[PDB]
Amino acid sequence: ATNYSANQYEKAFSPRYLQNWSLAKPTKQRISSHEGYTQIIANDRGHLLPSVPRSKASPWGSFMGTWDMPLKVPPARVTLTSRTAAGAASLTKWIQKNPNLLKASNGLRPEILGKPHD
Amino acid sequence: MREIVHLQAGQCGNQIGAKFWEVISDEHGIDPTGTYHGDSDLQLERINVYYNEATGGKYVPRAVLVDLEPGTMDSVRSGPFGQIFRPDNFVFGQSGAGNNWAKGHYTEGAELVDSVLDVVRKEAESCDCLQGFQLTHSLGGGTGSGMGTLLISKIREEYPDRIMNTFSVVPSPKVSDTVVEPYNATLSVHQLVENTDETYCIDNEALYDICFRTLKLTTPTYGDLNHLVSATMSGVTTCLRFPGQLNADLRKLAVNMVPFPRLHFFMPGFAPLTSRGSQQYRALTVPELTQQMFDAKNMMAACDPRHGRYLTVAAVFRGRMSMKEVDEQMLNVQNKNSSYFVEWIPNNVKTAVCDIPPRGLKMSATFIGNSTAIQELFKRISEQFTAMFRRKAFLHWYTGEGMDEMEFTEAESNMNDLGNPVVTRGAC
Amino acid sequence: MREIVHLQAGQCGNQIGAKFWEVISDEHGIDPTGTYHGDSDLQLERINVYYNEATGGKYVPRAVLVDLEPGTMDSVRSGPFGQIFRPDNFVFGQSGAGNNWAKGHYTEGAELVDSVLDVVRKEAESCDCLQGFQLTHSLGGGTGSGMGTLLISKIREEYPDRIMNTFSVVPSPKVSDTVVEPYNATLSVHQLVENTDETYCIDNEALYDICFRTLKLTTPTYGDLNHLVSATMSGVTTCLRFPGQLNADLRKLAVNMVPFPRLHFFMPGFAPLTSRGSQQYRALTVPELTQQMFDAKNMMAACDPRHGRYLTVAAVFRGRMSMKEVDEQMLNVQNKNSSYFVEWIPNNVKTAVCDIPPRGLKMSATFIGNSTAIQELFKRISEQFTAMFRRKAFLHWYTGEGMDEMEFTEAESNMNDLGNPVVTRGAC
Amino acid sequence: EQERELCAEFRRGLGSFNQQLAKEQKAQHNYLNS
Amino acid sequence: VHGLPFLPGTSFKDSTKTAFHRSQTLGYRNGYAVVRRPTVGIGGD
Amino acid sequence: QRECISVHVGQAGVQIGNACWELYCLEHGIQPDGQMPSDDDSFNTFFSETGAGKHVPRAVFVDLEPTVIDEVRTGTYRQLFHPEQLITGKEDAANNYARGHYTIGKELIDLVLDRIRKLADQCTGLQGFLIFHSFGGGTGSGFTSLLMERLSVDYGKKSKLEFSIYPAPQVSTAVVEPYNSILTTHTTLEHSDCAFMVDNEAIYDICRRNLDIERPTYTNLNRLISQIVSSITASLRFDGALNVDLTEFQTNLVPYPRIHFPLATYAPVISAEKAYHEQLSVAEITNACFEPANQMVKCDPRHGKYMACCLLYRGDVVPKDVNAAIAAIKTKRSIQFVDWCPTGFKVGINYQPPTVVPGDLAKVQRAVCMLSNTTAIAEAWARLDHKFDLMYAKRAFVHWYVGEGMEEGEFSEAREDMAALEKDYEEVGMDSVE
Amino acid sequence: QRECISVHVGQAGVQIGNACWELYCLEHGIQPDGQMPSDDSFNTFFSETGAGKHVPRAVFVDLEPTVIDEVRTGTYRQLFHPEQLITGKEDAANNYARGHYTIGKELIDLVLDRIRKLADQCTGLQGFLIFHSFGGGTGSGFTSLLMERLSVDYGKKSKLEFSIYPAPQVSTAVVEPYNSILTTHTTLEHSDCAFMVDNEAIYDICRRNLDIERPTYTNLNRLISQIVSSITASLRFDGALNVDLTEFQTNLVPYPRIHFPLATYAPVISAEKAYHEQLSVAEITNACFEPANQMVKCDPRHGKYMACCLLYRGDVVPKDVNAAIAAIKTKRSIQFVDWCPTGFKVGINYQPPTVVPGDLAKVQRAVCMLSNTTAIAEAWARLDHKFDLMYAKRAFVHWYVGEGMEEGEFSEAREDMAALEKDYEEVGMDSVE
């Protein structure tokens, strides 16, 4: 699945318009045109060719469930406005000290906006 | 006697064709059985184009219904206009493509192309002048895209001058209906680009928008979709069936559209599509027909014309309208949207004004568009195809039918190439 | 022929424009079903400025309804004149603005601006000679302010030579209705100053004063309050809707009240207003119309014009009346009150006098005043904004939605740089 | 409008059908003994 | 009944209505904003 | 297009829930069987037609202990709530936040988040998630935290109000309440949006003096909390003059990041006999909401300054009389107001007169509900701290928490951030002297 | 012209067959005494003999009496030709060997003959729907023997293997691990689509969605029967998008080996919970993905989808099906492999699911998904871990060695099963470029 774009008809197939309220997968907007053939990367059984520098993520998706998630979960929203330097540092180090929540299918996807008073 | 042989293929084809003939027969009078129980003799002046009288005043449809396993055919015979067709014009088999282009263009297709070709020959050599042949099919899925493409190729070889309009439900963008759809399409287009004349492209996610956003139906059936494709398929062949000023046939539409050989994948669109409750807030006037026809929310193919340039638009208006209310709206819709029309071609819009409107509507209009934005469809199928071929996905069920990989590779190249022509002429 | 596209954004904009469409449908003779049921042929003469033609004598308002919460449009539809608008002009989005200028301008409203501008484009190109846009909104709060000014900027970059009239409900001096009205008013006025050509500032406290002291209403509702804004709306677009002597349309009014481009904030006023105990004590004449016009009791903004100097003044009359009385009264008011008018503009008052009054009166009069007293409103928002912005109060959501410190700093500095040219005329 | 009415009716029909099945299915559960 | 013009001040209210529900004739369906026609108004009538 | 998922968590919740959804029903007609006795679409804000004419509540009652939810599965409203929306468990949570955010609570989280998703995938426009709990109990303080946090992970910046029963100013029905309360505020300080607070001691008095009920129980109180949930959601169910949605209460109340604890106060809470002698006029109803004897959270609003107050007039309220009242209350130098908030009075004038449940309270043709964020809630946080410390000093009743998954240290980090909260109320209070 | 022959094997298969045929006889009216009470849609499953009698195109085969000697004295004795029901005289006693080498090479001959006769009375065969338990002897031993020879004869003809797979925890056989590894080594290159329906899963689903705390193998077979009646509704009833048996393979099995699709059904309500539910195309589709409504205890979320095929039987308006698959293609909880851009097959029929006096309710619409999740790796890993906890101590190897299975096989089998692990992993990795 790549979740392509229907170009003109996208306000229908937007996530919040199809009654999906959880943070959903994004849609790929610009389609890139390539030319010529594309070489084979695998074999008949589906195993990758030997040269082929592979990825580093797990072969299965990182669905981090209710027992694998870190305790004291960082908030989804953080805007660092009218907040002190110490509290801003505490919140930023919190969301940076929880790394695996940031890189997950059922991840956090935080919004880090604003700027504390020097 | 400009004539037409409607070759239907696969579920999509037979089903879409069933509704084509229902729509076409209602306008020409032909009844469930096949009798002209109609009025204005004009509905019988040019019935030769699509019907062949049979001793008894019965009009039989010139349609070779093809399929790889009598299934949609049973539904066709059970549906309203299902006895109109001649029992023998139904060439079927006993197997099924199983959404495999190979099992349709090589294995179970080869042992069923002679039968279809033999009916095409009896239905073509019995014509004073066969303008050409129509093919309702589905690029995504076997049979329609397998046996269908084989047929087009063969017909082409035998009759190389007659036209070959191909109405094709192209692999829709967002959701799919066949996993091997990328593969199927890439292969089928590699054949159409070099075997057809006017391939109209009818994605389904598009038609769904026209049903929920324009017509306003909170319960659409595949039937309503068929009718919309069956209306475009009707507009293109009105002047070869009824009188009218500035007449325009099929060869004309091509000549006055296809710029360079290949570039010929068009996007269709109807016009007076209105709501059962909004027909009290609108106004059937040529001005409005122009706007609806040139809005990238009516086109029956997800390819926002706006992300591109129109190399040639075609507008077949059916109705009694004022040439200067039509000729003008064309100039304005071209001089007030210059960025979306090629400047290396003056007047990028042809214009037919027939004089018999679709029963029930005062004025109508079909819209054939040769946009450069059609690249998006081919570029999406190429990306989806490269994601699979790269890792021999669902390919044993193709190389196990005989298809060598050279074939598959070639397909991508031809498609990837065509993907350039469109951008070369989309940017001077 | 001239046309006006009516935009209504926000809850306040939707309700005020709903009452305005009721007012002008009563004036033109359009029933709630949408037909014509009238008495004079002067009502269809200039009906193609707010009403588009449809089939079978349907007249449909040329209005775009915009709101990011589809709940106030629901009450508008459930009202009396609900089945008169286009269902396709009901552009809503499922969301909640929450009275954020940031959320109405730089987020989710930006996901509706495309559909809104599509409808606005359709209405604008369905015209012969468009003259401009009339947007109804409230500065205090979201949707009307943020999304409204986003449409103001977008429509201005699409059409740079059309008159933009913003009927804006400004924040109140005594009480308030949204906590972040200083923020919304500061940002929305910052957008309004370098954009719109005409701005009419209506204040609810002044509306309460003219409903209790002048009309002597016992239970005033928002229908009553919206009605007088609607009356000024109908009064200003009178010369291009009904015949008369010395016609003055919107552009002529703009030319004769703005001496400098930034000084386009006005103060509306209607003055056939009389109480229930006093309409039979009334002494109907053009001098009492001038007297009840110019006094600081019927001003619809909470800015006492006696605390400043009138830059420019307009009066649009509505009724068969003599010219000697009108001319001598509006020379006499300037000759008597000499410290309330600028001396460098000799005869700083305009006169338009149309012939056809509102149905129920014999003389009507709409007051437009560009005065120095709007310095009070902009200054009041300035200390409220400064007291809210020194402590970074309620800046949590405005920076959480994407905006910055410099946004608010620039807005406050621009509103002060408009407070300076307003006060420089009081000291010449 | 007529179309909708027929649809809503079918739903009520199924409603009663299932409603019945419920009672005649709860019995087999109360037959756990016997 | 009393027929008066729609001039400001003549907007007399019926103080017998106790039903004030709004109906959702603007809503969303399978991707799209359906704009229904109102069969009832404020009060359920 | 204005639906509101309600997650009632804990006895208090399940119980306020019973009261809340009874009022919801009697208001739109939905009978104790779903079938509305019509022979229109307003109900969608809380109900979901099946098509067979059955309206199912849009809620997810969740309680690790049975009993409470089980009396709802066998009572008047036993056919309204879809079985799988009443999710109970097997073992309780012994007034121990620990076994509510760590052990016997992280088992029901998966299923509740599941149900919440289905009740969201049917909404055409969710406004928010009204969570009702009690600051002082296992599920109330434990499951809410876990639920709130996990919600934020999914529904990210989506509104999430929190009607709550704040610890009492003297009574209290537990000995470990103080702890659970401080721990809860910490895990929700950054994950909740606008948490409304109603103290029980307060309602108890408001019921003995204004509603003539000498011996009030939890039901008399619960039913008054239902009238407040009505006014907060009335705009998105009935027509009015100044509609107020559930996304504006977060903007026109919560001032700075942490501070998010508005307080509730109702109006025309009179009692038949004492209503034959009262003109319950917009002014009277408003002045009353600012009287330091009606604030449904014992916290004398005089010993503090107002930060933001959003009034909600439900009924026959002439818009002019509202502007007049707010003006009068502003003049009164008794009521105070911070300097960084010139305009601090928000107004919402709906039209549907308060609904009368066949039970208590008078039939008023006018009523207001104020939701101010007074800095006078600081006293409460200080009192909660005295308590937390009087015990943490001897690490009393901590064995139970370390006996679940709460590493002793967490107790410290919690009260430390509660001290930060108190220091915040001092700053947001001081008025720039410049 | 759309015929399909069922080859129910083992007690498991003979009992899944009872329910299946009760539903097939109901769908087409065919009475228990083979006589349609006064059209040609039964030909997919029932052939009509001169004496107005619709006989079943099936071959119930058990290497012991009992199970089938109860279908010959049951309420459906005048339906099955007294030759289709083939029975042995000595059970394979939980020994793939006593079912692929001993008691079995003495029945394959007759079985293949009855198959040929039923396969000669068919103009167009869509394929053979086989039913076997991946645990017992006949279920493992014979299925292999049958599949291997079925290939040699009917070559291209499809061979769909509906099968009961070992469960995560519960299990009614100590020699199950072995038998399973063995059968999945011989039916890995001679089968086609192998739909797996674990019991623990169904047992749970029942208690949770139907409220039947203590179910029975019947409650199960009935639900497995509705799954098969959904795969073969287009070959009989009418639809908008019909899917032939041949399709369920092409558009599902990615690489030759990965031929083990999973299963799941929708509206699994109990005529009492269905009174508070809307059962809309969205509700039914999102439920066919919910990990709690899957027919093989395995959370697909901890895996990656490869090709889901969603069938829709009932009143499914096309646009509904679209918005549903589209909302799925947006939710993060569900993730797909990179090699499969388009990954959804859609079959919209019209015949509403039939009600066999039992447990489920009459529903207007209902779906059945066959996803090829890579989350089934845990199953193979677990299964092989057990085959290794034993084939290390050479436990219960004397039994198989004494009926044929030359010990050597156990090893070669576990080796191929280790390749299964590798494939599933690699066929789900990614490429930086």
Ligand SMILES: Nc1nc2c(ncn2[C@@H]2O[C@H](COP(=O)(O)OP(=O)(O)OP(=O)(O)O)[C@@H](O)[C@H]2O)c(=O)[nH]1
């Ligand atoms: N209105 C109302 N308030 C309640 C009710 N029950 C408890 N409360 C308040 O809530 C506090 C504790 O309630 P909860 O936190 O919900 O109790 P719980 O979480 O269910 O924990 P346990 O039932 O003891 O296992 C008490 O101090 C009460 O003040 C109730 O039924 N109605």
Ligand SMILES: Nc1nc2c(ncn2[C@@H]2O[C@H](COP(=O)(O)OP(=O)(O)OP(=O)(O)O)[C@@H](O)[C@H]2O)c(=O)[nH]1
């Ligand atoms: N629906 C249904 N499923 C069953 C029934 N009996 C067994 N099963 C399934 O079949 C599995 C075991 O089948 P096998 O071990 O292969 O049976 P077998 O090969 O005939 O072995 P024996 O009975 O000892 O001769 C069990 O785990 C069940 O899942 C039944 O009566 N009805």
Ligand SMILES: Nc1nc2c(ncn2[C@@H]2O[C@H](COP(=O)(O)OP(=O)(O)O)[C@@H](O)[C@H]2O)c(=O)[nH]1
């Ligand atoms: N317009 C229209 N499209 C259809 C209809 N039926 C099927 N389709 C399209 O046909 C595609 C699949 O057809 P296909 O499986 O290839 O049929 P086949 O040619 O017999 O193999 C789907 O993507 C559908 O969108 C119909 O009745 N009308």
Ligand SMILES: Nc1nc2c(ncn2[C@@H]2O[C@H](COP(=O)(O)OP(=O)(O)O)[C@@H](O)[C@H]2O)c(=O)[nH]1
């Ligand atoms: N004249 C008039 N003003 C109104 C009406 N309704 C609301 N308002 C004003 O609208 C302001 C608030 O509207 P606003 O917050 O902008 O609504 P929003 O656009 O949906 O966010 C209040 O100050 C009211 O004075 C009405 O019916 N008539």
